[model samples]
Target chain A: PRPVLRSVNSREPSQVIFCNRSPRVVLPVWLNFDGEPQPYPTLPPGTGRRIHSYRGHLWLFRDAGTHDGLLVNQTELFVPSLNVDGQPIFANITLPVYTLKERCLQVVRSLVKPENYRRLDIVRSLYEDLEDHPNVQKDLERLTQERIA
Target chain B: MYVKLISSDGHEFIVKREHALTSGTIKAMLSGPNETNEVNFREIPSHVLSKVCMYFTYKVRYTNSSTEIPEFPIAPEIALELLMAANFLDC
Candidate 1:
């Protein structure tokens, strides 16, 4: 059976929606813009969420169920276009099973230029809290191994 | 058709109608119900307006399709001032 689909028509250029069709697993999603991940809410299974599109074209995703799950997808960045009357267009991108972090190090690898990241204070204080999480640490280790192999 | 823009320093720029409309604010101003063919920039200085005029042509030429955007230089000294004008112009 085909998964049920929904489309959102956003007048604003920076808005996009994420939909989850999986029945068993909640989808954990991460947004990256200009070489860093911005905080976003996780998508519960069988649900949809709207979000602001960032400047850069990258995202990370995975199942929220298991500690050892590797990051599953990274999307190519594409910008939305305008219609003839100059109104911003809307796009519907299907949610794929995707998923991130080594502390900030693994996160840094996802950036276009790791050296260009200057906000160390935010990374040390705020981002470190997520890095210290046990499940996140295990997943980071798994992702790192996959990259090496 | 040509439109006239008067900078604060009293310098007048005569630009092509399409080129000047590259800016959203300018387009709105020209199309307003009480529209006039002239635009008066009481806050923008002459030098800044001149640079903005150049950028209008550049933006019109390069912003369509897949053409790469050419370098539009802004001197460090005038960068902030230019940004303010660009914001007001909605370019």
Candidate 2:
């Protein structure tokens, strides 16, 4: 006998949703940009000093031949869980590009590309799940094109 | 005992011996079907139907012998899919 079937669609919960509102394009590991290993002046307090790779590609120890540079192909967007040290607070977004100018330019243009659909979708979905805040919507639009060098 | 399993989306089914034996959990309940003719409606949370159906089809086509396993390994996604189906089938 033929059997019956059904489909289900689900979205992630609201409480875990976070907004990535930075003026720089996050690059995956392995891309070369301007001055990498750039110290973040305004990192969240108590978060300590950490290497912020472009596209959320994080590295703890420095790679061979490069002062903490671990070169690898860049994934569209790399989002990592926020770290808490002396206190539990969200880490500020950081963009680590070797040749900062070229990478930033690439990020602005790459926003419309299809490969970044996952990041784009999640950002929009998170916004929708978070009561559709106007600032978030505005920040996303501006951040999509905003570049930091 | 024959179990009537339902999917999260409300699909219903009646499965017999081969169905029950596929699931480790149901296989443990194979004392006697007559006395255990109670309908166990299980709700599988993560898996969908198509994946479970594929497992049954794969078993029949390839046989359960470890030696005759196919060359191409089943993908993690497909394996999870089949597991969900098995949970739904309670086999």
Candidate 3:
């Protein structure tokens, strides 16, 4: 299901580090009370932002180009949760994952844009080459480094 | 580099060296060869300390703003306490 956009609530304080792992601009925004997008600092590729939010607060990792979603917290919406055993949350930004059918549709929809679409091919190909590997995170780091190399 | 800032109630906030140094007291304390990176504010209650740390992040983030930076919002309840803490920290 496409994740429902949730807004902030009065919950326990949470410190989240939203790191941009992709090689493109990522905008991290909080869903305001009216479900409006309230922008936070933009995270350029490989950058990060320290977000002071609450546990129930919903943040969206968006592609800066189209303002569409890119996610790793699964469900497209990230809720900062304290570790069950107690630890700060690290909400990382990575390529969005989709089922084979969903991805095919996304590509088809994206390719139709003449104003130009971005991050689609990069996200697809990264996950394509990586959909295996136990330590995909490390491989992503090396892969991104190699892209710049 | 990182530094651990402890509140009076013992909550520890590990922040970046550059961010924490936005406070003059913290900068002085972190200076010199014999300095330690950990700082404890015995007089700063946990709640105020957290807000102060929030301000530290805010200040550092906008330090290089090309245009006007946004004001740091303060809760009415802690206005006085935050002002006091801010004064002490020289931020």
Residue lDDT tens for model 3, A30-138: 8665555677778888687776788777677766754545664443567787656556688777654322223233334333343233433334443343332223234
Rate residue A140 of model 3 by lDDT: 32
Model 1 CA lDDT for position A121: 33
Q: After superposition, how far is residue A126 of candidate 2 from its true place, in Å?
A: 28
Give the docking tier of candidate 1.
Answer: incorrect
Better of 1 and 3 by TM-score: 1
Best by lDDT: 3
Screening candidate 3 with a backbone cut-off below 3 angstroms (N, C-alpha, C), the clashing residue pairs are none
Model 2, runs deviating above 4 Å: A1-149, B1-3, B29-34, B37-42, B45-50, B64-91
Tens-digit lDDT track for model 1 on A1-149?
Answer: 21111112334445545544433243444433322333345656557666565332334444454322322222322343333373333332222222101212322323313343444333344334333433543443454466557
lDDT of 2 by residue, A1-149 (tens): 21111111122111111112223222222212321322223322123333332232222112121122211112222233344353322223222332211222232323333344334323353223223222222432343455331
Per-residue lDDT value at B65 in model 2: 32
Task: Compute the DockQ of candidate 3.
Answer: 0.01
Worst 10 residues of 3 chain B by lDDT: B63-72
